[model samples]
Target: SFGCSNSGITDSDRQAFLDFHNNARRRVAKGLEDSNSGKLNPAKNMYKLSWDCAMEQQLQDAIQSCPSGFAGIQGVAQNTMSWSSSGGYPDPSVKIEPTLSGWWSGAKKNGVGPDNKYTGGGLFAFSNMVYSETTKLGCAYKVCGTKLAVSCIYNGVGYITNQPMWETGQACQTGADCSTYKNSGCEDGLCTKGPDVPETNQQCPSNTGMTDSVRDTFLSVHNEFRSSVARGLEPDALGGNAPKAAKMLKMVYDCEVEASAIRHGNKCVYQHSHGEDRPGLGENIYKTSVLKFDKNKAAKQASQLWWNELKEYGVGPSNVLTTALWNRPNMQIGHYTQMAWDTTYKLGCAVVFCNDFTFGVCQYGPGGNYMGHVIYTMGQPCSQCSPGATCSVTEGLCSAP
Candidate 1:
């Protein structure tokens, strides 16, 4: 108290000052302890100005425990205040020396998602833990999620697909396979997302001028080529994605009109993509479906599992695609589901015409300028196909339609 204070300052004033000092010291000590535990976030919110680790312990002891309130003592702290044990505010459970041996190594010990940790949901499994604000990893804790997790980056913007994953998962290989998996579909060896359409409502649109039989055939053919070409964001569906896929047969019929628009010069040959280097992470969506590979049918179909090659080094999803393209930003639409109805409507009309003469050809997965050579869609039918027969695109069957 500048000029008037010495005699006027009451005992309550002195005690209050001491109380505030004690509170500050306590909070400061806790902050330091928390930082050592990883439970204390280094970001602006936690210790932006609290030194690197609050006031050092040496200095804290010197101030309050110097000597009893004598002529030399600081006098602010009575030095006989109630002592309390450290509860370690915020995340007291954080580990002092967290174990991180195989957290980022492989998929054997994965699954740490908010929903069903042991369900083995690829990155989703353990991402929740790695991103926590408070809660350090205790020693020898479970190994899962991203090793470093999703720390915000300032170097560049936009999603990075090449993120490494250990104990990964991909349950789908094709759109049809989505029906068998728990979504994310087969993206390489991992299941990245839900079925093209929700599994509960697998009822895809068939549209006008298209019979259920026609629509079914159209969808099968559509999926084959659609899966092959429109792998990622390339396949655009109408209605709502904002194309709103739920109630979308209405969008299907709109695209169907285009087939008749160019039917005159149409040559419906299911030209399979020639295999090339794998596509870039953002090139196409879904698995690039070329010709439906059947080991028993096509000479060079998905003879081995397709994901085998993709799993090694690819920046990808739920294994679902999160940042998709369109008018919106960061919006995701099921490329598989969108094409199922849209392409079927458009292509079914083109190939279904009797005069168009639909033939089949062979190639490989769509990649680099579709960078590949033909495998002769002609002969070399799989021995497992029905006693030597050509695939009927019109009927979407193994033998003749």
Candidate 2:
């Protein structure tokens, strides 16, 4: 019923406000449509609606009360890297940073950020510099193969050589592939084998042969000396204990030799004199002994010997029964001396002894010549001596020994 008068609002102001309202309305409609179509989640639609409403209200307020023209008022808004400017709504590429300040300030807080200093381009530059410096130092420089790299890390430098494939202009997929330059014969893409050298005569024949009796004799003497030493006897007294120690020494030697025979292809050597014109004993022939003993067999023999001795003395395992059985104190020095001398004599005899029972039959002339020379033909070459030592082929003697 009341009459109305015209408001003081300018036409431009009214038009600006109407434009902002229309734009915001369009954004809300789009957001709602996206939510319903499953293109945007409920949370995302809610955020879009809030942002659109706030921005539209800001624009409308500024247009209506700016006093001057709408162009005089500036409106601040926050956005992200993916924000679009065509009024179709913010681009999906945009994302907010997780920090508190990102939400408060109207500025983009995150994107790809800065590059790392230790890796990527920096690592390549560093490797290049190192290679260049190494070359300048008068050392070879090249990319290492995978095998070489792993070996180098464990053994240090100089353990590997750079191959042609690792050279500047060479094409390669891995360091191992590059090793072909250094050595053409590569196995599993790595340089592994080297040239072989033939061995010389002077570096052969490390050990010589003796007879079974001689060997037994030596073992007897050596064992006696060892046992005497164990019993607190001085070195000077070893000769006196030899004869008594001979039996045990022979046992041990035979056991060891037999064990070696069963496990390894070993043979004993015999002594022989050569006639004036013939080759002197030409090298002793190797023959296997008839008696062979394993470790368990040897141990059983030793235990039986100990038990038999105890039984002879009428002694039981009890301490009281064995007290009076000990008899070393009654043996005279001369008796021990004879025993020691016998042991030593036997050992010396064994050193040169070559009996069919202890060692195998001698393969004369035809096959024997090759048998004695096996050490020379099959053994490893001797290492070169330092400065002042002389080398001997037949003796295989070194200055240090």
Candidate 3:
């Protein structure tokens, strides 16, 4: 939907600009100087920059009038250049390479300091070029009267008074450093987009003494609530009860998910783990200040609180999921939805007493709480059960022997 005007700049010119920036990034990634002794450290998460038409248009509009400086766009970093030849005017296009070359020369003189903070001035262009999180580049040039002017804008606001230019460490320390980005990995010490790399799940150390009884309690509480929904006996917070589910799959406990949860629980930070830390899973975490660690009680209470969300905030009468209901201002429905997500049959949970608090975490596989879908099909329970599943009329659930 971007109305991008190339402004008579050829495709090759754009390609040259892209090559100019990436080559600089690669050089920085290698921890070597392009020309002088600007030897920098290797970057672990230096994301590659791709051209954006919107950015180009923004820059074009800024320099169209040949202003003294950039248009003062907020949350953007800028590099500007101007050139003139008195005797005879050369083709404006001929100035692109040398102008870019001049801007990059700033990197040789001033980049980030050893402490990883921007050193201020002289290296604005280089700082923007090498800012690790900046992933989009937009540039524009104009031949005004007898002079040529160039402007480039980056997606991030780098070169702040005192802020990190980039994190210098062993590139791609783990897949997580590059996992969120697509087709990105370390190349010669820079994170660049190339081919997709599979992320391997690193197992957490088994240091916690999680008892079978605690694990059993986590499963039973979830199943008990699931059974209520399947039998259409679960009360809704708004009013009435939830409709019966036809294909409610029985949940089986998973140790891998438990280990992942334990890893986070042990940290005692009281926050959700990163998505990469628990790939292909949804999570629910709970914490309560307590003097004694009652693992069973913690498991039961956390599960109860998560399941109680249904009675505290109904998902509406249609039985369909919507972003509005899940994210309702004062109520939390996501935990309840994940617990009752019919297709999500694998569950893992852990409870830890850390920092004078009981922390509980549960992870669900084939993670649920997806938008625009019902939590479960409304019909006769077990009628739509998958293969190898048996009906439990008493509980109104589908079970595996």
Candidate 4:
């Protein structure tokens, strides 16, 4: 039995509620500010925070108490009263294409339509007949009952019954009974496909529609706010500026990271290349290692090796490594520590699965922004430690005073 008349609310409704609450609180704060100095009112902010916290707590309590239908009327209006169904097939003699028309016609002829009064014959009967007919016809036929059920539900055909016959003994007492295994019928409690009820939430289309509609919306909102700020708009005037900008940036960063990760898996091979200073040494040095870590002859060798690899790849400044490294600055011996710290602290969290790693790679300044960094631990033994130097692993400065 449908226990509650209410169902869950849609995302749009929830957003509307949140917007109303925020507006109300803003109005209250404005009133308080008018009465006061109107500059940096912590008390009003605290009050609004308290109100929001209380409301959140109440929502949490409601959700906990009524896990099924806590959203009340809004939920019911959004979720219940929806229906879906699948077309049945009949008549083995007619080699129908199983398209929409064929299936519906088969159902109608086999007494499965809405006007069909034959209680023992319906969509279920048609489906079974079609299955047997198709099998007998030497066609590769599989039981598509589960697929039909899913399609029916998704298409808004509720109260599904798979019963092939609705004789006196087999007649379903309720939609549930029709859906029961013993009845062998498919029926849903609600018909959701009609224009009266929305097939899905309003936010569903935004989220599931075009590949990047949501992302585009987010970026548009951000660019709008940035344009406003560029025009010297007050911070208070741009209500959700920061959040929009943050969301956009996050989306962009995620996309870039994903692209980089894919490229890394395929082409981020650490190979030796030629450098500017070509010594007689045949050892090829990697460009990243040379530019960021090597010194004197080692650096030259690494640079040469890097150039060789770059030439082999036929890459220009637009190369992934070049672009990634160009975005950052300050790549040198003394600056490596700071770069490592920034990478490990600021961007480390964004690197999936590398959150636990202590060390991080970073880019260098100048033309080689993509030169990798090997961040050294402050308390760990220094890689460049002199022989026999006492190594200590504790909270201590990286360099001696």
Candidate 5:
């Protein structure tokens, strides 16, 4: 939200560049000088707009838009991805903490930003998972189901960097997505480098080596969280397990914190992440799987559960269920609009209802980054937080490593 100062060439100065090549050829052919000598060459003094100068040409535009020579959408702390029900981004400066920050860089920025291409059923997809121009989180982290050594772009955002890093024309995530979800090009599939697969399209594994404690813990958290729906007590980060929940929390940390390998089926779920980077899987991840395990539903049940657990803060209620709206949109609570709820359950509702007026004092303000946040903040990428931030029961949120 702060204004930045640009320290680049001014428009008038650069615009003053004169590429009189055409004019020179027409008028001064008689005085044509063999300026090019194989042995020696001098720097040409000319300035003009051309495809070659596209990057340089936009320097002025960048300066005008953002004074800091950075970008106006400074990624984190930016209120650009946000809009309100009553008023659209009412106050540029006023926004709920962690409400709309770099975590939501993949989120839309108005217009058809949240269209079906990016969002449907009011839930975001891969489109909303891509990076933004103000991409502050520079990730080359590995992603779900794809066991590759290289980094692949998932959305338009740079996978490793955010510099149009793609193979082009391909239906890229950044340049592509997993052939399983949408799948790609060099462009059309998951940008995750390494052993990439379309797990979405792949056959669901009959047997997943999902740990029992983690499984039970996921369900337990869901029920505990469900106590307060309609925006009740959704804590900031995970890890607020009870005395018995210690095993579960420890597992998540050991596995996820070290970029551990988890099983999808006979095959292992991929980890595109590096040391203490973050979690992975597709959209509507933990909220859906904990209720019911499905191979095709998305493999990383173990890690996914750990990931959700990592968000638990020993605050009011460790709300962590993706009931009707986010889990199964087809079968959500009646009073509510919709959800991508779990198919196994006939009826559904959100586990922890924060900011939801019906539940409690749902300010919908700070200390909440539910499923959406989990999805957008994959790779645990951050500039604001310290390196290797993880769950801390005492802190009641993700604390610095």
Candidate 6:
């Protein structure tokens, strides 16, 4: 206990709080996520946070004075406080990390808008956690008779008016910046804690900027091609029907993968995102220089172009995706193989309109284009689907759970 009667912030809780903030800041440094102004630019001065016992005591004093109910003390300057009594009574053993994540989600919902500014609608706690100059933090939780209150106080000025949250530029460009905190250093242009934080490909329900119609277009188009392959309707190089696939999985749109695609497309570069950035993911990128760029048209055209690769450069007699087939001279079919990769069920796409060109990208989970792998099992359509998978009558594909 950090000198509190109802149990104080434990060592692990403090570390958890710091890790949550620092890892998010690390993402900002790496430019892997988006802000209101489109894709985030990597940061140059994101600071790692360390716990301060003095602030913990300050928070503890404030929380203890409140009555033992839902009523709680207000946060002083430079502090973010939250209270929850979701269950029957307060439990000191309750996990605290979820509360921290809530603050983050709340911030995103409110709007981490243009220029990294906190587009105000009241939730600044998430903004405070990411405020770059604040290097020191102190957090404490108090359990009243029926409720719990948490407070994390930062070291510097909390939120600034008319200022971007942090300075964004080339991350860790200065050698000294990475060494600002103990046990922290630069990795992949991101200054991070030792034993780097594992990337969590969590779903992004808020990002992607896709309308319902746009989402449907992507799913429908992709599944249309997938259905053709599954039903043995696609023609092969030998002018014969391609064999039916037994276990072709139907595509379900994923918000997180769409968010990843949005990030890449927003860059407006025709280049693909690095494999390291999107681990266990396959990518198809398309670009056009139309004077008028439309997301819906772009989405359809991109998937159609990728699907056309199969007809343009057919997979040979066997439906298998072999090394030699992928490298066939005078024909490029990698996009087709990725699109028809039977095992991949999740699909997400994004289209961005740049000044000079419009960019589109789609990402697949458990990715495709693996060498020496069959595009799909040759047999009756959806005949050998795995358990928990339902066969789609129209698509001739398996809907996996």
RMSD of each: 26.0, 38.6, 20.4, 28.8, 23.8, 21.4
Native-referenced Cα lDDT, model 4: 0.23
TM-score to native of every candidate shown: 0.18, 0.14, 0.48, 0.16, 0.19, 0.48
| Deviation of model 6 at 239, angstroms | 2.7
Model 6 TM: 0.48
Model 5 lDDT-worst window of ten: 357-366
lDDT of 1: 0.24
Give lDDT: candidate 1, residue 278. Answer: 17
Error of 2 at 375 (Å): 41
Q: Score residue 375 of candidate 5 by CA lDDT.
A: 14
Tens digit of per-residue lDDT, candidate 2, span 1-401: 11112132233333332333223323322332122223211111110011123333333343332223222212121111112234432221121112112321211112111211112221221121111101111000011121110000000011011111011222222334333122223222122223323323231123234333333333443344434422323233212311112111111333322222222223343433233322221212122222332212122222222222222232221212122233435422221221222112111111212334233211112111121121111121123333555434322222322
lDDT of each: 0.24, 0.23, 0.74, 0.23, 0.23, 0.69
Preferred candidate (lDDT higher): 3 or 4: 3
Deviation in angstroms for 88 in model 5? Answer: 44
Model 2 regions more than 4 Å off: 1-208, 211-347, 351-356, 359-401
Once fitted onto the true fold, the runs of candidate 3 whose alpha carbons sit more than 4 angstroms away are 1-207
Judged by lDDT, which candidate is best?
Answer: 3
lDDT (10s digit) by residue, model 1, range 196-265:
3311212324332223333333334444543332223222233111111111111122233322322321
Evaluation by TM-score, superior candidate among 1 and 5: 5
Poorest 10 consecutive residues of model 2 by lDDT?
A: 147-156
- What is candidate 3's TM-score against the reference? 0.48
lDDT of 3 by residue, 1-401 (tens): 23456664666677777878888776666566553454677766777778878778777777876788666653356888877657434566677788788877776665456756666668777777777777788887887777778778876655653456777665664445674255576655556556434432233235354767677778888888899899989989777998889999888877788887878778878889998999989899987654234566567667877887887678766788898786678877888889999988888888876755668889999888779999888898888988888878778778784
